[PDB]
């Protein structure tokens, strides 16, 4: 199996589209007074994470173009030190996207299952505290992941983080769906596009986009660490760039199933 290359046009196009969408989301939140609750601060944070993923990969794509082409032959030393910054940016945005997705999920769970005490335990100050804590921990982890890269435990740390934040998100959303199923059963018992089907579609999308857009990359990392010479793994590792494209397509999809599934932002976007 041979290493797979893909055109830089893919990275550039996805970066532009995703940056457009996420800037649109953040402006749509800022241009509407009724939407300064804790639930939209997390959406803005997720838009920031997605746009950083996109623009970081776009800059590194343009620079791969500038280096592979003979134009402006850079010194060998420059490219390494000036790479580490872009790769740190990608790692920071990568981790922060997962952490913001889990933040949205935990907030929704608290909203449903702690329904009357929600406003007494999720003040806006607490929302911003959690947001800034997420971003600082993501930054420190990103820099210590790139700087200390060839070490073995940096990959294992990422694999554990992602699998934890996959199964936790799954449990939260399945619990919410089962509760909604129970409620719909208790609405059908009244004296006189099924709701179970609607909830199932929503949960399958929210979990399947996450899996089929992030888990290929971390499966790649597991294969890198564990099985580096058996051809049962080399053919999977051959597609690095495709997995990166999956992550950037997730950055495109995310401000479309979380921020545009609300009529408030929908009508704000329609107005603007």
């Amino acid at each position: 199996c041979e290493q797979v290359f893909i055109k830089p046009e893919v990275f550039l196009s996805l970066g532009i589209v995703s940056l457009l969408e996420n800037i649109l989301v953040i402006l749509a939140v800022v241009r509407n007074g009724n939407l300064h609750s804790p639930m939209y601060f997390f959406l803005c944070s997720l838009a920031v994470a997605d746009m950083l993923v996109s623009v970081s990969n776009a800059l590194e794509t343009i620079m791969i173009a500038i280096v592979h082409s003979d134009y402006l032959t850079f010194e060998d030393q420059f490219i390494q030190h000036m790479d580490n910054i872009f790769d740190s940016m990608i790692c920071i945005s990568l981790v922060a996207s997962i952490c913001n997705l889990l933040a949205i999920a935990v907030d929704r769970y608290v909203t449903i299952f702690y329904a009357l005490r929600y406003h007494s335990i999720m003040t806006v100050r607490k929302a911003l505290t959690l947001i800034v804590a997420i971003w600082v921990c993501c930054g420190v982890c990103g820099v210590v992941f790139i700087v200390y890269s060839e070490s073995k435990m940096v990959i294992v740390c990422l694999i554990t983080m992602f699998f934890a934040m996959m199964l936790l998100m799954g449990t939260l959303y399945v619990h919410m769906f089962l509760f909604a199923r129970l409620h719909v059963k208790r609405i059908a018992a009244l004296p006189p596009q099924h709701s179970c089907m609607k909830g199932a579609v929503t949960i399958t999308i929210l979990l399947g986009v996450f899996i089929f857009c992030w888990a290929p990359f971390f499966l790649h990392l597991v294969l890198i660490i564990t099985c580096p010479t058996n051809p049962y793994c080399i053919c999977y590792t051959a597609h690095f760039n495709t997995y990166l494209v999956l992550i950037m397509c997730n950055s495109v999809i995310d401000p479309l199933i979380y921020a545009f599934r609300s009529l408030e932002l929908r009508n704000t976007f329609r107005e603007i």
């Binding site: 990275f11 990969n57 590194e60 794509t61 791969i64 280096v67 060998d76 490219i79 390494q80 790479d83 790769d87 990608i90 790139i146 890269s149 060839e150 990959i155 990392l221 890198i224 660490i225 580096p228 590792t237 690095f240 760039n241 990166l244």
Partner: peptide, 11 residues
């Protein structure tokens, strides 16, 4: 330096 998109493509 061998350069490429992101990192950890190999080990």
């Amino acid at each position: 330096y061998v350069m490429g998109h992101f990192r950890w493509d190999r080990f």
